């Protein structure tokens, strides 16, 4: 092998690989994420350090395509997670087994269909959750509410009543001017998708499919507002 | 309805007439421009005010740092309290206090976590109590969830869109400030159910937490044009993909 | 032939996830117009803004 | 850069501003398209033209002056749109600047009864070849 | 453009004559031609920025 040309600009691969990882794993801001050749280059870039090869092997096992979950070789798995953290260069942002499993589930569909035009489709579900038992929300509602009632407040947080305010109008204006340039609409669009992802991030456990119509109702809240304006 | 407004004039004694005609398409355009600019300014002002108020509160360290910590009992509760007061004022500008009984609980365990609504309430187990999942809340603050702005739009009747092309210490990052909008909208959502139960019984509150759907009935004769933070209403995903 | 085939192969978007638009239009005219009484009720403050 | 129109009036961004494509203008003035040694359409000369057979420091040459006509025409074409919008709204740009085209209809009764710079009125090229 | 000129010309084995004026060039380094309007938008945007 001659990576001087077969790995020319190792960055060329690394950067796109990291982008893709931050996309499929966890979440990131929207982008026109795709290049099958980039996936290939991800593999090739992995083929040059053991702190890659370990991961590479783990993911390659998905070519067996069955959803069987490998044993955690506890020690090596932990060291591997550390290596992952490193290679992702993130500020130790709570990289975890669960996110690793999520990426595993992503590859559980990645290679598995040659849909050679556009799988322009969310595949929200994960088989590789701790069980496919798939019980409903309501039982978990009771299960949570029990311990919720059992818990006692950590602090006795109310006495009397007050409100804070300030009127440094000049200061306010200063602040406003400093803030002004920002493209508000786009620079809050992100938060919607953030919370949306947070939803599943919570229910990664015995999940229930339905979310869509409730979200649509949240959105038609504005329809309700207009009807109020129309009485 | 192109409505080429049509006009004529004459001298007294009807010596001879003159005619003209004109087109609203510029006027409506300009009005829409002014309206949306104005309302955007208003919303930005409101957010600024909120931020300033928060700033007043003697924080020793940045917000994200606060949440990443978990030893606190004051700061987070206080923040929640303040946000709730702000919202209640935005609905009742003359109203200032809630008559005590407000109490909060930190929650730490997946084995206590609850889907969707991250913040939950028992309006009276004798008195009000509330609960918060700091662990989960922290997670949204992954900045890579944030990136520079796309500029897409759709359905433009040509110059209807292009016309805008001819229409002219906490000194801290825009994206950092943008973090706040998360908790803003979250607390807003929560306050919805809170207000519902405050007005009515527990079982309908449970139904609303099963589906935030039936609200569309009860939230009438309730919002007397006191607009809320949903200006850009094209919230939507792909739908046909639901595939039952 | 292999070349021309791979050219297509490498251009097959995959696995794309969710989205939001948000960007919105409101109304043309029938949405409630301002009425002069409201504008007067605002402008009257100039009587005391004075100077 | 912009397609076609090398000049763009922003009529009032608070006040008028205009755009200039120096790189293109330089392309146009790269010239050398020109040489006078030519031949031109004529027909039926005995009736039509044969009679026309029998009638008659800066010391710079002419080619440059010929080149000036380029910018003359360009600024004219700009002036059209500029005048129009200065007299009317923006939205008609949706038409005129997609395709100037019918704008002559608006110009009806607008011209001052004096012509400009369309003497050799048969300016045309092959059309049916479009093979759309 | 010149390069592509000859790869245009050789296409014809036709000898009588060809009025054809292949004004367009296929090969201009893009997936597919966009509209003009989009370009107009995107340019004018940055254009207004300039001082």
From Swiss-Prot, chain B:
Acts as a cyclin-like protein and plays a role in the modulation of host cell cycle. May promote G2/S arrest by interacting with host mus209/PCNA, cdc2 and cdk6. The cell cycle arrest is characterized by an intact nuclear envelope, concomitant with sustained activity of host cdc2. However, viral DNA replication still occurs in the arrested cells. It comes from Autographa californica nuclear polyhedrosis virus. Belongs to the baculoviridae E27 family. One of its GO terms (cellular component) is virion membrane. Disulfide bonds: none annotated. The gene is E27. This is Occlusion-derived virus envelope protein E27. Keywords: Host-virus interaction, Membrane, Modulation of host cell cycle by viral cyclin-like protein, Modulation of host cell cycle by virus, Viral envelope protein, Virion. Interacts with host mus209/PCNA, cdc2 and cdk6. Forms a complex with proteins C42 and p78/83. Pfam families: Baculo_ODV-E27. Its main location: virion.
Swiss-Prot record, chains C, E:
It comes from the Viruses. It is found in: Host nucleus; Virion. Coiled coil: none annotated. Plays a role in host nuclear actin polymerization by recruiting p78/73 protein that is capable of activating an actin-related protein 2/3 complex to initiate nuclear actin polymerization. Forms a complex with proteins E27 and p78/83. The interaction with p78/83 mediates nuclear translocation of P78/83. Interacts with protein Ac102. Interacts with IE0. Belongs to the baculoviridae C42 protein family. This is Protein C42. It comes from Autographa californica nuclear polyhedrosis virus (AcMNPV).
């Amino acid at each position: 092998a001659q990576p001087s040309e077969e790995l020319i600009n190792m960055r060329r691969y690394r950067n796109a690989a990291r982008k893709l990882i931050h996309h499929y794993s966890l979440n990131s801001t929207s982008s026109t994420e795709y290049k099958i050749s980039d996936v290939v280059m991800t593999m090739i870039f992995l083929l040059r350090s053991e702190k890659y090869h370990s991961l590479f092997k783990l993911l390659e096992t998905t070519f067996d395509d069955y959803t069987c979950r490998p044993q955690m070789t506890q020690v090596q798995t932990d060291t591997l997670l550390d290596a992952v953290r490193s290679l992702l260069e993130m500020p130790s942002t709570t990289i975890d087994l669960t996110t690793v499993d999520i990426m595993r589930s992503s590859f559980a569909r990645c290679f598995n269909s040659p849909i050679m035009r556009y799988a322009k489709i969310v595949l929200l579900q994960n088989v590789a959750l701790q069980r496919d038992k798939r019980t409903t929300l309501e039982e978990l509602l009771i299960e949570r509410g029990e311990k919720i009632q059992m818990l006692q407040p950590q602090q006795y947080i109310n006495s009397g009543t007050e409100i804070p305010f300030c009127d440094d109008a000049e200061f306010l204006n200063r602040l406003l001017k400093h803030i002004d340039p920002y493209p508000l609409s786009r620079m809050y669009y992100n938060a919607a998708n953030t919370m949306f992802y947070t939803t599943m991030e919570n229910y990664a456990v015995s999940n229930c499919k339905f979310n869509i119509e409730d979200y649509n109702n949240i959105f038609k809240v504005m329809e309700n507002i207009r009807k109020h304006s129309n009485k | 309805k192109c409505n080429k407004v049509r006009t004529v004039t004459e001298i007294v004694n009807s010596d001879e007439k003159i005619q003209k005609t004109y087109e609203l398409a510029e006027f409506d355009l300009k009005n829409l421009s002014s309206l949306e600019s104005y309302e955007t300014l208003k919303i930005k002002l409101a957010l600024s005010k909120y931020m300033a108020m928060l700033s007043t509160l003697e924080m020793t360290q940045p917000l994200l740092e606060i949440f990443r910590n978990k030893a606190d009992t004051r700061q987070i509760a206080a923040v929640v309290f303040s946000t709730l007061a702000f919202i209640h004022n935005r609905f009742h500008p003359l109203v200032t206090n809630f008559t005590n009984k407000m109490e909060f609980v930190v929650t730490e365990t997946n084995d206590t976590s609850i889907p969707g609504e991250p913040i939950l309430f028992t309006e009276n187990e004798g008195v009000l109590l509330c609960s918060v999942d700091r662990p989960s809340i922290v997670k949204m603050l992954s900045r890579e969830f944030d990136t520079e702005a796309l500029v897409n739009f759709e359905n433009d009747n040509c110059n209807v869109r292009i016309a805008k092309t001819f229409g002219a210490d906490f000194s801290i990052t825009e994206v950092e400030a943008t973090q706040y909008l998360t908790l803003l909208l979250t607390v807003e959502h929560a306050y919805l159910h809170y207000y519902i139960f405050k007005n009515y019984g527990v079982f309908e509150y449970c139904k609303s937490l099963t589906d935030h759907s039936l609200f569309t009935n009860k939230l009438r004769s309730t919002m007397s044009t006191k607009t809320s933070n949903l200006l850009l209403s094209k919230f939507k995903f792909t739908i046909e993909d639901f595939d039952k």
